[PDB]
Design a protein around this nucleic acid. Structure first.
Length: 246
DNA sequence: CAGTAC
DNA sequence: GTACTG
C-alpha cells in the first residue's frame, strides 16, 4: 500500500519521489493529510488544489483556444509577434497535458518588454489563475509557467508555458519546445559525438572537450534561421514534428 | 539536492 | 542532454 501512496503524492506538481517518501515517513497517506499537515511550497500548494484537473489530458481543440487566447492578447500589443504552440500540440497528437507557446518577432527587437505586460494582460481577462515559476533572467529569453482557464461553464484548469525568444534563436527554441524529450536528448547526444552543442538558444560548433569528455570550450555559434538549418548542420535528414514524437 | 521544461 | 528556479 506504500507504492500507491508514493504515486498519489508524486502526481502533485512540484513534488517528486524524495518528497513523496518524506511525506510517507511522516505518516501521511492521503491528499487531505498533505494539505493540512505538510509543509508546501507555493508551487506544491497550487498543484494540490488543481490535482484532478492537472491529472486530466486536454483535447487538441481546447489547446487551440488556449493558444489563441494567448495569441490574441500578445498581438494586441503588437501585430508582428508570432505565437506558435509547441510540445504535444505541434507534434500533432490528439491530447495534450499542457500548452507550450513560443513567442518571437521577425525583426528581433520588438519582442522585448512584451513578456511582462502580456502576463499582466492575461491576468486581467481572468485567464491566468496561478503562477508557478518565472525565469526572467534566462539569456535573451524569458519563461513562464502558470495556470490558465478558458472562459465558460464547466472548464478545467490547465498548465500553460510561455517563452519569449529573439528571432536569432527562434529556430533552436522551437526545436526545444516541440520535443519530444527523448527526441531532444538523442539529438543533443549526437552533438557531443560530433563535437558540438545544442541548447534552446543556439547550435554551436568547434566545442572543446577534455579527456573525460567534460566540456571546457564554448565553441562558436552557427546561425540557424529555421529548424531545417540545424538539422542539416547536424548531418541529419529533417524530420517533421509529427515525426519527432519519440 | 530536488523538480521541472522539452 | 541542456537549462532553469525551489
Amino acid at each position: 500500500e506504500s507504492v500507491p501512496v508514493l504515486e498519489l503524492f508524486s502526481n502533485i506538481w512540484g513534488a517528486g519521489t524524495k518528497t513523496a517518501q518524506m511525506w510517507y515517513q511522516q505518516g501521511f497517506r492521503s491528499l487531505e493529510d498533505i494539505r493540512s499537515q505538510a509543509s508546501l511550497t507555493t508551487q506544491q500548494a497550487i498543484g494540490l488544489k488543481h490535482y484532478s484537473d492537472f491529472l486530466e489530458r486536454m483535447p487538441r481543440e481546447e489547446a487551440t483556444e488556449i493558444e489563441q487566447t494567448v495569441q490574441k492578447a500578445a498581438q494586441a500589443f503588437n501585430s508582428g509577434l508570432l505565437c506558435v504552440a509547441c510540445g504535444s500540440y505541434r507534434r500533432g497528437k490528439a491530447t495534450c497535458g499542457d500548452v507550450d507557446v513560443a513567442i518571437t518577432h521577425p525583426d528581433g527587437r520588438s519582442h522585448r518588454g512584451i513578456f511582462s505586460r502580456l502576463l499582466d494582460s492575461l491576468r486581467q481577462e481572468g485567464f491566468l489563475t496561478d503562477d508557478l515559476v518565472s525565469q526572467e533572467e534566462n539569456g535573451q529569453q524569458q519563461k513562464y509557467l502558470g495556470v490558465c482557464r478558458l472562459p465558460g461553464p464547466g472548464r478545467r484548469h490547465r498548465r500553460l508555458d510561455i517563452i519569449v525568444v529573439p528571432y536569432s534563436e527562434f529556430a533552436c527554441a522551437l526545436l526545444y519546445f516541440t520535443g519530444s524529450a527523448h527526441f531532444n536528448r538523442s539529438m543533443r547526444a549526437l552533438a557531443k559525438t560530433k563535437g558540438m552543442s545544442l541548447s534552446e538558444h543556439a547550435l554551436s560548433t568547434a566545442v572543446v572537450r577534455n579527456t573525460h569528455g567534460c566540456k571546457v570550450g564554448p565553441g562558436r555559434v552557427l546561425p540557424t534561421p529555421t529548424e531545417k538549418d540545424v538539422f542539416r548542420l547536424l548531418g541529419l535528414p529533417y524530420r517533421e514534428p509529427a515525426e519527432r514524437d519519440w
